[PDB]
Paper text:
Distinct from other medically important herpesviruses (those responsible for cold sores, genital herpes, shingles and several human cancers), CMV contains an abundant phosphoprotein, pp150, which is a structurally, immunogenically, and regulatorily important tegument protein and a potential drug target. Here, by cryoEM and sub-particle reconstructions, we have obtained structures of the MCMV capsid and its associated pM32 (pp150) at near-atomic resolutions and built their atomic models, the first for any MCMV proteins. The ~5 Å 3D reconstruction shows a highly conserved T = 16 icosahedral virion capsid revealing the molecular boundaries among 12 pentons, 150 hexons, 320 triangular triplexes and 260 pM32 (pp150) dimers, allowing identification of individual molecules. An MCP monomer binds an SCP monomer to form a heterodimer, which constitutes one of the five and six subunits in penton and hexon capsomers, respectively.
The structural components within an asymmetric unit encompass 1/5 of a penton capsomer, 2.5 hexon capsomers (1 P hexon, 1 C hexon, and 1/2 of an E hexon), 5 and 1/3 triplexes/pM32 dimers (Ta, Tb, Tc, Td, Te, and 1/3 Tf). To overcome the aforementioned problem of weakened densities and limited resolutions, we have used a sub-particle reconstruction strategy to obtain structures of the MCMV capsid and its associated pM32 at near atomic resolutions and also built atomic models for tegument protein pM32 and all capsid proteins. In total, we have built atomic models of 55 unique conformers, including 16 MCP, 16 SCP, 5 Tri1, 5 Tri2A, 5 Tri2B and 8 pM32nt, amounting to over 27,000 amino acid residues. As detailed below, the atomic models of pM32 of MCMV and pUL32 of HCMV differ, though those for their capsid proteins are similar, with root-mean-square deviation (RMSD) distances between corresponding capsid protein models ranging from 1.95 to 3.36Å (2.47 Å for penton MCP, 2.09 Å for hexon MCP, 1.95 Å for SCP, 3.36 Å for Tri1, 2.05 Å for Tri2A, and 2.10 Å for Tri2B). All bound pM32s are dimerized in MCMV and can be classified into two types, either pM32-a (cyan) or pM32-b (orange-red), based on their relative locations on the capsid. The subunits of pM32nt dimers cluster on each triplex and lean against two neighboring MCPs. pM32nt-a and pM32nt-b are similar in structure (the magnitude of RMSD is 1.20 Å) and form a “Λ”-shape configuration. Careful comparison of the atomic model of pM32 dimer and the corresponding pUL32 subunits in HCMV (for example, pM32 and pUL32 dimer from triplex Te regions) reveals that 17 residues in the pM32-pM32 interface are within 3 Å of each other, as opposed to only 4 residues at the pUL32-pUL32 interface. The existence of 13 additional residues at the molecular interface of the pM32 dimer indicates a stronger and more rigid pM32-pM32 association than between pUL32-pUL32, which is congruent with the pairwise presence/absence of pM32 subunits on MCMV capsid.
Author numbering:
A (entry chain a): 1 to 180, 194 to 233, 265 to 311
B (entry chain m): 968 to 1121, 1146 to 1352
C (entry chain m): 533 to 580
D (entry chain E): 4 to 49
E (entry chain m): 50 to 484
F (entry chain S): 6 to 294
G (entry chain W): 2 to 233, 262 to 310
H (entry chain n): 195 to 242
The structure:
């Protein structure tokens, strides 16, 4: 019926491992790029989870490039996938740590190994590590905790600041508790430079005030002047690239045992 | 913590007086700053070390391939059709699911390197700029950073892609022996065929136990600065250490197939699965449509690699130190084989006579 | 010991611990004669 | 299941070797083999 | 004025077929419509060992018996072929009397037909390509196979360290002496010797049909040498007296793998197949181990045709040739036999000759000047892809020297702190508190 | 021969986008009698709704449903109508607020006054779920809620409209034309004293498709809240608030069909705006300030 | 309606329809969205020949256009299927950017490096198509319009022109385009205010951890971003959650100022790099 | 000869590496293939 | 200039401009890359580097 | 496919003439004296063709002394004169 | 094509003393020979 992506099992999938793939019939699949044949080494997110110096946001910058795809059926030597048509309903499988509820917007995130390190049907270093289809309001929440832990990561030498971090990685949502760098440089370039460059621009604009809002906005070298504002706006572009989490689903109703949920596919 | 370290005094205690020790102690007072090496080699003054430039050379080559009669059964099926709808240009993808069950007992096929078509590499003497390889690493001082990046590394091609990498080595090291015979540029030959077919601790004893002897020389280490774990060859040219560190993965590095600890520990699986690994994971090629040398992105050919990952030796080409030696090599129509040493000089002969063979063809 | 030319490395038995020291060889002559020999330094002096 | 090989019939074929039949499993021309010297009583346990 | 649109000379495509090509004498192509339902295919072999003991007091082994399962590896293919929806629009719509109905009806039909015909062409050439890539990825190089033939014969167990050291020496010597073979000037007889060496050091497989792939005269082939343009024509021009063009019988159809009534219930019951099941079960109700006369891969009712091939004779073993650029010309995909092979070179620069033990051979030829530029081997010269001398030094090597990853020590601190003192008692003394 | 003759069969299935959906539905409508729910390009979902939530939506049909993230773990997901959160927003007249507070409030609701007015709107408790058709009154109300597409009777007999209440609509009714008309949904806060304000809700229709040109016509309306948004930025140092406004796509309709109406319910009637051919189409949140 | 049959209504040539026959799959905007339109409305050119003619009014105008895809060009009939939100459509390249598979495309008014004849100036009317740029060139070319409008606030009359020429040669992927001699217009000015207000609130919400993060990092680390940005405690995390979140309200808005509408998201790119399968209007 | 040896193997725009090898092929083939009658000549080399 | 290396330039055939300006390896149609090869000396040199 | 294309069906009445042949590459190739159609004409045979060739060489080219040397020193033994030590002239034979 | 060239007639006699070959480039200290690319001296001496 729909779009088709076949996955050629370069590794030998034992019938018991097929028994685990035949349980994940609904589950999402991160595909690197839309093509009809892909290897099992392509299919999945393990090629993203792999570097000595690889940061959470950089993986999220990679996964945002990866096309979401949905498992259709596992026929032995092959995995059949469907790139989901936008706007249609899809039975995706709740392989995240969070129970879904009727009406919620679901966002793909890379799985975090903080207290919930997980693998799959692995043989020869390839498992099928599966992205946390997490609710959208918690997806922004998880992002904010990761940056604030990293903004406080330099001041480990204070125990009180370390006790501020000790509360911080405790993430608690409906029926679920889980534990959790240039992006924080990007946070700090906006925090410091907007403090200094706006003062010559508030006092000039505050005379004429159409929406009547510049009045309490005041209450709140031209080459180097633009050089600040260039490296102001481009760092604002860099953080907004890794903030707007591009929502992926809308669960209409949840199948019982919370394994699956019919989800109309959005974005 | 002293500036003057021990070999100053232990040189002066046996130094030879009268106008040469007086000045050579002041030449031993040359700084080892990066900008000191910069101005030093800039004025041509040779710094207190000797480096070894390594280089790959890509040869587009006809490979003949025998295959025995009815070797492997290509089991196939009916090529089935699917239809993707791209709304004005619909695409019928069509597929044939095929397996290949194996041949017999032995290998029922063999590849033979037969005829060089081209040399994609130029055999150039470009340099692998680590300012571009590791783009993140700069100095803590703005002024020194700008001085270095204007000292070096702040559209055109005629012989195919340029190829290079780098190793630092002590200036004692025997050009008289070690460079005459083809080796590992790490200093200590780490060939996995020498070590036992699975023993990881024995393989680590080959690589980094320098109290264990070197294979194939028994002089246990030629470059201590670039053979040890955490040596300068190791912290820069291993991809494990290079990936602890912040680098660009795009660049090809002929050092990596020597200095990668884990990628040569993984070539320690059972002498025939060794060569099956050599056939399976030969997907580290060089991208075709690039000026310099960047690795391949999505394969498409299991190329035959070099004897590294298999024999772990790099060749040497013909290497005359002075053009006196080089013009006495190529005076008239002569070979690139003479090993000749002038007192402070050397001519390292080429192993595979490529300067003879590609001239012949 | 000789992990690096420009830097010298050895252990130091402090108060209960063999801490390493990564102390930079500041001059070119801080290398041993085992690595930068006497004739090499003299010949380099001639080059200057 | 190697009993399914050694107990059921087979197919008389010409074989080939690179080196040696007992080195084929120690230098591992193939992995997941089975080697045995005394004639196995396990195949008699059905 | 005029333009003279002359005859549009539509060059018709050259057809290929997998069984007509010479690679199918190494292949054995079998349709099996539940290949999309297998896990794999894992042929088990029972080998009675070649058994011998002897002597008095010689350590006599007991009766070794080997069983060995070989697996199947996939490589499935998908091409696309596109039809424009504007091309389909008139085949759907089909106007009344209008140039479109007269010509572009049949032209949309022919656009479809051309797509399917180039699709079948690409399916056959993708089958060519995948079988060639399975051969290449499961074909170790010739010096490797030569060394394994030579120094690995007598070694019974897992190989000894000394033995595999000589195996490494054998790979080294055979690779250096045996690289770029046709590029190296070799005699006709010496190339015949090396092709004898190839076809002897390779191992002729299990499946062997007396009916197919025999030359007229009952003379059966033994495989094929596949190659590219220049190497094929150089082999022909070398061995043209021995290479005789002959029509060779080839199968004109595919083999079949069938699932029995029994065998489907077997695959349902415990998710496996034993091939040739009723041919086992008749042996069950007979005396058990009477070996089967027609295997599932050997009972093949293959139709047959002939194709003109260039066979030759090496090792008294008839070997076909293949010029596979006949199927790879004008195609997008490069030949897998046209293979880039990179090789790593090293050389020293700046490397101080130890002057105490020094000397000068070739001072008869060399007259250098007594300057320390000459006395320190600082720069080093070389030739490029062509004979262009090329100077290298620390000055050109500044791009790797002055970088701060040299003059950092963080990872080096970490490795030296982790890898502690080795247990040499000189070190154990030298453990000290001074700095 | 073989290959190309098979590919003609996979080619010559023309005149339909697949002819896989339409043909294979018929071979199961010949099998099972005429099947409903199959000639339906729009997209629905059946939801378990209690009797205390069953009202309004039951009687007059075609109206929004909203999920709650109520901060209590056991009933954490309460269905909310667009009529229902009129007892939260500042826009709604207190008579109009207490009209529908007395419809819902009969001994099964008024927690949800106290855990929406009290447990404030963070504009993340509400989720635009969709619009209704074909309520199932029985032991449990079972609402077929449409997701993408129109709300309509089965048998394609009547397009169910969107029942927008009047107070939430005319304060951001768009301009007058006869085109297609997108329905957006806007929550605006007046940050004055009580940590969120009295979180004001809006059903806004506009011909404008683009994002920042749409929030600019909100930058006309909401200066009273925007100047208060700047106020708590300096009225509280350390404490901060969040978003000023919150925009999301909710659907569209045909804009000649925009006409007023009324629902005829318990606790009096309620003046609404009836948007007839309402294609439900939920969009993403646009948090702005 | 979706399928839009188009009247040409001008006197076209054989050399006209031959160009669009190879351009089938291009992006044409229509304002009215009928089934039957004329080429006065069909096409983007009819508004880029205005008399003021700055990027400030052309960019804000065409976000009320409705994009279509060129189909079935034979003779005088133009089939323009209005795309639906979320189906895969292929698009022929209208502007020389290679579109770099996997990213979001947008709509750029007109090249405005001169006035390009989009098809052929037929009866002094050409049919000019929008540029479809991969949202990085879209945001950057909209950034610099406000960069150089903030510049003209505090410059006299020449250090604008000495610094606009520094910033107008936008060297992007395959393209070196030109800022259109930046005219100070009020649609920028109403939104340059809210940018300056958005910069103000981030200074308010910067709660001395988000502030000092680079200035604490330069003491410990030596990074390329860290050195170029040198020239350029409390136990209240729960409050830092709300201040960072309210800071994220601003930066998702101040980016949305200079960003454009997300549009055709690349499925695949041909090796010709001309026709590009794309989803998500 | 250079074109038959390398060029039509690829079909796209000629690679920055490949056309450089084409230039080198012009150099080598021209310097070995200028004045065939005047250079040394076997009958076999002439027929080849 | 009198210092010019006969080693690095004069024994092999080369462009007597000093900088190799052969237009067979360059981006062919690109006149800007062509002038980068000919007259831009901040650009590297073909055939000698 | 058009079985008669207009270039393809150029029917030509046939005759014979004694010509040279060669069996090269199993592709029969004829020869032609073209001198015997350019005999005693003003227009020379265009296959006879001047082929210009550019030749460069340096003169006065100083060598740095610290890397300078002298091979072929068994062949040469100059006068120790700086007229020999700098290049000033450059010698080369003519056509003959 | 860098032709056959001698800086000094000493080098030139070393090149063409007798029937010898040409391309010997053979640098003296300030004196240098340049080897011809095409052996034109040999080919015009021959043919």
């Amino acid at each position: 019926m729909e779009t088709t992506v076949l996955v050629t099992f370069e590794q030998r999938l034992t019938t018991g491992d097929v028994g685990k793939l035949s349980r994940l019939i609904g589950a999402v699949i991160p595909i690197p790029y839309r093509h009809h044949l892909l290897g099992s080494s392509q299919v999945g997110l393990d090629a993203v989870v792999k570097d000595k110096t690889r940061d959470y946001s950089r993986m999220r910058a990679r996964m945002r490039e990866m096309t979401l795809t949905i498992m259709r059926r596992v026929e032995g030597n092959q995995m059949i996938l469907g790139v989901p048509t936008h706007g249609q309903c899809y039975t995706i499988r709740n392989t995240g740590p969070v129970s879904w509820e009727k009406g919620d917007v679901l966002t793909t995130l890379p799985p975090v190994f903080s207290g919930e390190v997980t693998g799959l049907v692995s043989v020869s270093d390839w498992d099928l590590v599966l992205p946390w289809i997490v609710p959208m309001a918690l997806a922004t929440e998880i992002n904010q905790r990761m940056m604030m832990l990293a903004l406080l990561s330099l001041d480990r030498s204070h125990e009180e600041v370390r006790a501020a971090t000790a509360q911080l990685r405790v993430v608690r949502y409906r029926d679920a508790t889980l534990t959790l760098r240039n992006v924080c440089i990007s946070l700090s370039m906006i925090a410091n430079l907007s403090s200094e460059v706006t003062l010559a621009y508030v006092r000039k604009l505050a005379l004429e005030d159409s929406n009547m809002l510049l009045m309490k906005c005041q209450e709140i070298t031209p080459t180097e002047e633009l050089n600040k504002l260039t490296a102001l706006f481009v760092m604002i572009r860099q953080i907004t690239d890794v903030i707007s989490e591009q929502p992926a689903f809308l669960v209409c109703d949840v199948s019982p045992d919370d394994k699956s949920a019919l989800c109309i596919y959005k974005g | 913590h002293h500036w003057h370290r021990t070999p100053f005094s232990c040189y002066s205690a046996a130094c030879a007086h009268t106008l040469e020790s007086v000045l050579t102690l002041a030449i031993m007072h040359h700084k080892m700053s990066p900008v000191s090496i910069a101005a030093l080699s800039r004025m041509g003054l040779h710094p207190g070390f000797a480096l070894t430039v390594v280089r790959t050379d890509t040869f587009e080559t006809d490979t003949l391939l025998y295959s025995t009669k009815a070797s492997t059964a290509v089991i196939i099926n009916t090529p089935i059709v699917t239809k993707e709808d791209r709304d004005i240009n619909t695409v019928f993808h069509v597929s044939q699911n095929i397996n290949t069950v194996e041949m017999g007992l032995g290998y029922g096929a063999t590849t033979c390197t037969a005829h060089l078509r081209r040399v994609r590499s130029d055999m150039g003497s470009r340099m692998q700029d680590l300012f571009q390889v590791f783009p993140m690493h700069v100095y803590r001082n703005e002024d020194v950073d700008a001085w270095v990046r204007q000292a070096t590394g702040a559209p055109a091609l005629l012989h195919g892609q340029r190829a290079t990498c780098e190793v630092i080595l002590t200036p004692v090291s025997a050009d008289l022996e070690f460079f005459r015979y083809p080796n590992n540029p790490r200093g200590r030959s780490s060939s996995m065929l020498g070590v036992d077919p699975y023993d990881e601790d024995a393989a680590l004893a080959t690589l980094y136990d320098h109290t264990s002897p070197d294979p194939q020389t028994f002089v246990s280490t030629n470059n201590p600065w670039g053979s040890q774990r955490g040596s300068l060859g190791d912290v820069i040219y291993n991809t494990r250490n290079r990936e602890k560190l912040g680098h660009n993965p795009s660049f090809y590095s002929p050092c990596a197939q020597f200095f990668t600890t884990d990628d040569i520990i993984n070539a320690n699986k059972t002498l025939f699965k060794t060569v099956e690994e050599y056939l399976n994971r030969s997907q580290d090629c060089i991208h075709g449509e690039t000026d310099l040398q960047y690795i391949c992105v999505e394969g498409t050919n299991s190329i035959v690699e070099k004897p590294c990952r298999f024999l772990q030796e790099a060749l040497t080409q013909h290497t005359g130190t002075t053009q006196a030696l080089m013009e006495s090599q190529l005076k008239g129509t002569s070979k690139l084989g003479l090993d000749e040493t002038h007192y402070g000089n050397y001519s390292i002969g080429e192993t595979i006579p490529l300067q003879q063979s590609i001239l012949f063809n | 010991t000789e992990l690096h030319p420009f830097f010298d490395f050895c252990f130091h038995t402090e108060n209960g611990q063999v801490r390493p020291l990564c102390t930079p060889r500041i001059m070119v002559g801080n290398l041993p004669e085992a690595l930068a020999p006497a004739d090499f330094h003299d010949l380099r002096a001639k080059q200057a | 299941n190697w009993t399914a090989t050694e107990l059921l019939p087979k197919l008389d074929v010409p074989i080939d070797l690179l080196t040696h039949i007992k080195l084929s499993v120690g230098e591992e021309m193939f992995n997941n083999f089975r080697l045995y010297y005394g004639d196995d009583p396990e195949r008699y346990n059905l | 004025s005029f333009e003279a649109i002359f005859g549009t000379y539509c060059n018709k495509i050259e057809w290929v077929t997998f069984l007509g090509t010479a690679l199918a004498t190494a292949a054995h192509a079998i349709m099996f419509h539940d290949l999309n339902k297998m896990t794999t295919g894992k042929m088990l072999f029972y080998i009675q060992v070649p058994r011998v003991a002897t002597g008095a007091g010689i350590p006599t082994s007991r009766q070794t018996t080997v069983m060995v399962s070989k697996y199947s590896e996939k490589s499935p293919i998908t091409i696309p072929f596109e039809i424009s929806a504007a091309c389909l629009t008139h085949l759907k719509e089909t106007f009344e009397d209008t140039l479109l109905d007269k010509l572009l009806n049949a032209d949309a039909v022919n656009t479809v037909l051309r797509a399917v015909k180039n699709t079948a062409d690409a399916m056959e050439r993708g089958l060519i390509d995948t079988f060639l890539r399975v051969l290449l990825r499961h074909a170790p190089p010739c010096f490797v196979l030569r060394t394994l033939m030579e120094h690995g014969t007598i070694a019974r167990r897992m190989a000894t360290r000394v033995q595999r050291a000589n195996i490494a020496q054998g790979f080294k010597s055979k690779m250096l002496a045996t690289i770029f073979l046709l590029d190296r000037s070799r005699d006709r007889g010496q190339l015949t010797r090396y092709l004898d060496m190839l076809t002897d050091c390779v191992t002729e497989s299990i499946l062997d049909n007396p009916e197919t792939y025999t030359v007229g005269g009952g003379e059966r082939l033994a495989g094929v040498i596949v190659s590219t343009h220049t190497v094929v024509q150089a082999l022909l021009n070398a061995l043209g007296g021995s290479i005789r063009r002959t029509g060779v019988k080839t199968p004109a159809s595919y083999g079949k793998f069938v699932l029995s009534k029994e065998n489907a219930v077997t695959a349902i019951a415990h998710h496996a197949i034993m091939a040739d099941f009723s041919q086992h079960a008749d042996r069950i109700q007979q005396s058990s181990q009477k070996d089967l006369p027609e295997s599932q891969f050997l009972d093949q009712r293959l139709t047959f045709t002939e194709t003109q091939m260039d066979v030759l004779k090496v090792g008294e073993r008839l070997v076909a040739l293949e010029h596979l650029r006949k199927v790879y010309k004008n195609t997008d995909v490069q030949d897998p036999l046209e293979r880039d092979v990179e090789l790593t070179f090293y050389f020293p620069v700046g490397l101080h000759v130890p002057s105490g033990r020094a000397y000068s051979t070739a001072e008869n030829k060399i007259k250098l000047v007594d300057t320390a530029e000459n006395q320190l081997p600082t720069t080093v010269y070389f030739y490029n892809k062509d004979r262009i001398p090329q100077r290298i030094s620390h000055a050109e090597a500044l791009k790797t020297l002055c970088h701060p990853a040299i003059h950092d020590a963080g990872p080096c601190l970490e490795a030296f702190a982790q890898a502690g003192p080795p247990q040499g008692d000189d070190r154990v003394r030298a453990l000290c508190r001074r700095e | 021969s073989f290959g190309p003759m098979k590919r003609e069969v996979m080619e010559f299935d023309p005149e339909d986008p697949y002819k896989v959906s339409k043909m294979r539905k018929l071979e199961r409508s010949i099998a099972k009698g005429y099947v409903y729910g199959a000639d339906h390009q729009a997209i629905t979902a059946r939801f378990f709704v209690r009797e205390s939530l069953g009202e309004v939506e039951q009687k007059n049909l075609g109206v929004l449903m909203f999920r709650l993230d109520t901060g209590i773990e056991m009933p954490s997901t309460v269905l909310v109508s667009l009529f229902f959160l009129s007892m939260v927003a500042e826009n709604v007249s207190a008579a109009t607020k207490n009209t529908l507070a007395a419809i819902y409030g009969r001994e099964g609701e008024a927690i949800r006054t106290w855990l929406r007015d009290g447990a404030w709107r963070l504009h993340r408790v509400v989720h635009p779920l969709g619009c209704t058709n074909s309520i199932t009154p029985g032991a449990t109300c079972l609402i077929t809620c449409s997701m993408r597409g129109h709300s309509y009777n089965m048998l394609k007999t009547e397009i169910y409209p969107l029942l927008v209440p009047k107070e939430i609509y005319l304060d951001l009714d768009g301009e007058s034309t006869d085109e297609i008309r997108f329905v957006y949904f806007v929550i605006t806060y007046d940050y004055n004293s009580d940590r969120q304000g009295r979180p004001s809700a809006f059903v806004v229709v506009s011909r404008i498709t683009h994002r920042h040109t749409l929030i600019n016509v909100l930058r006309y309306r909401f200066r009273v809240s925007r100047f208060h948004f700047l106020n708590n930025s300096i009225s509280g140092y350390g404490p901060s608030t969040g978003c000023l406004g919150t925009l999301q796509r909710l659907g569209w309709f045909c804009s000649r069909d925009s006409r007023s109406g009324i629902v005829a319910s318990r606790a009096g009637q309620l003046s609404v705006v009836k948007l007839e051919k309402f294609y439900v189409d939920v969009g993403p949140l646009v948090e702005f300030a």
